[PDB]
Design a protein around this nucleic acid. Structure first.
Ligand SMILES: NCCSC[C@H]1O[C@@H](n2cnc3c(N)ncnc32)[C@H](O)[C@@H]1O
Length: 390
DNA sequence: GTTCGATGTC
DNA sequence: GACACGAAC
């Protein structure tokens, strides 16, 4: 993975250090960011690049190279500027996750990083480590996925950044050819407070930032592209989450270990449904996408809520709200299952129609763009619906 | 109990 | 680019 020139040039344009300052590129390989910074600002800095793979470290004589795991590296002195493109990926078993480290090393990461949460990600660890390595007033400029703007795994990271300094986020989107990742640049300075959210446009010099919104009192809340229209709609209604318990489907292994589940159709069995069975306002009960079948009546053994008809909302159709009332109460292996709270009196068809509306699709696309390939729980619970009495 | 993807597929 | 599962906690 190489960082496109326009991205490097844009990041360097945001970068700042005092003359004689210490400039660091983590995960540097050949040090494209060190090289670009030097080209743009000249030679009067102390340049350092840290690389775990001795075969990849390839810095000119004017830079100090360090052969180490950046996440476990303890330099003698802090830095004025840290810039670069850290590795992205979840640490875990190779059959399922891309980053492979000895268990002892993962334990060491968890010990080191106060922001480490859930499965987490190398890029979040790199962000925390870099902030920790910054002098007061120091600056970090990274390109990372947009997922930390909204995901629960990054809640402690956002809160950490909010209390450690001031943050600017510049949305780039899908800028790495033949990678699906939607990217942002983060410029964090280890002083002051607040969040500024920026859009970008491609331009000759790389990208031109366009200030979108300012949040001077940011405390680590999810970051979204709000507009007059999204804000008004949220104020007009009430949160969907205040009317429904939101649960997720039982997972594939739960079905696999259930004594009534089969891998072939047969008398008295129905397909275990997935997201590919959910459509806007209807459910395809016929087509099997899971490879799994079971007696419909026994689905309640996996989750009690499978016993009765209820609203189902899609998780993996991108930044979209796709909803249906499952009138048959089938077993599901995927999707959100919404159960009305005490005293809520719902008209399902009316709600389904609203959730599936163009206005709702425009709403979520606006707020969340393409940061993640899902509608998440945090997004879903905030969807505006009619205010309900008491 | 539920989260996440430099996801993959075509 | 439309449309999408189990290891991890
Ligand atoms: N900066 C370009 C993308 S990140 C890929 C590079 O980071 C290096 N790398 C991966 N994990 C690292 C770590 N924990 N510490 C330092 N370098 C790392 C890889 O060897 C590779 O050269």
């Amino acid at each position: 993975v190489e960082t496109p020139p326009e991205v490097v040039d844009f990041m360097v344009s945001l970068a700042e250090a005092p003359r004689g300052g210490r400039v660091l590129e983590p995960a540097c390989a050949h040090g494209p960011f060190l090289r670009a910074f030097r080209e743009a600002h000249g030679t009067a800095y102390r340049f350092v690049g840290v690389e775990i793979d001795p075969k990849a470290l390839d810095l000119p004589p004017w830079a100090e190279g360090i052969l180490a795991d950046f996440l476990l590296w303890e330099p003698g002195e802090a830095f004025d500027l840290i810039l670069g493109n850290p590795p992205y990926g979840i640490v875990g078993e190779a059959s399922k996750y891309p980053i492979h480290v000895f268990k002892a090393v993962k334990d060491l990461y968890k010990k080191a990083f106060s922001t480490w949460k859930g499965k987490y990600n190398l890029y979040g660890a790199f962000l925390e480590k870099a902030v920790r390595l910054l002098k007061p007033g120091g600056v970090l400029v990274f390109v990372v996925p947009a997922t930390w703007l909204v995901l629960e795994d990054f809640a402690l990271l956002r809160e950490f950044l909010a209390r450690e300094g001031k943050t600017s986020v510049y949305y780039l989107g899908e800028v790495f050819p033949q990678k699906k990742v939607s990217a942002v640049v983060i410029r964090f300075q280890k002083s002051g407070k607040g969040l500024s959210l920026w859009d970008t446009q491609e331009s000759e010099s790389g990208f031109t930032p366009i200030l979108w919104a300012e949040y001077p009192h940011w405390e680590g809340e999810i970051i979204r592209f709000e507009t007059e229209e999204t804000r008004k709609l949220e104020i007009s209604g009430m949160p969907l989450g205040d009317l429904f318990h939101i649960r997720f489907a039982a997972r594939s292994p739960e079905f696999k270990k259930h004594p009534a589940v089969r891998k072939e159709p047969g008398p008295g069995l129905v397909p275990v449904l997935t997201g590919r069975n959910l459509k806007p306002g209807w459910v395809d009960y016929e087509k099997n996408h899971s490879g799994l079948w079971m007696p419909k009546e026994r689905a309640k053994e996996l989750r009690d809520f499978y016993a009765t008809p209820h609203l189902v909302v899609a998780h993996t159709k991108g930044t979209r709200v796709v909803a249906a009332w499952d009138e048959r109460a089938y077993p599901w292996r995927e999707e959100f299952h919404l159960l009305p709270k005490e005293g809520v009196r719902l008209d399902p068809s009316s709600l389904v129609q609203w959730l599936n509306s163009e206005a709702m699709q425009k709403h979520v696309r606006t707020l969340y763009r393409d940061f993640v390939p899902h509608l998440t729980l945090r997004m879903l619970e905030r969807l505006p619906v009619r205010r309900e009495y008491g």
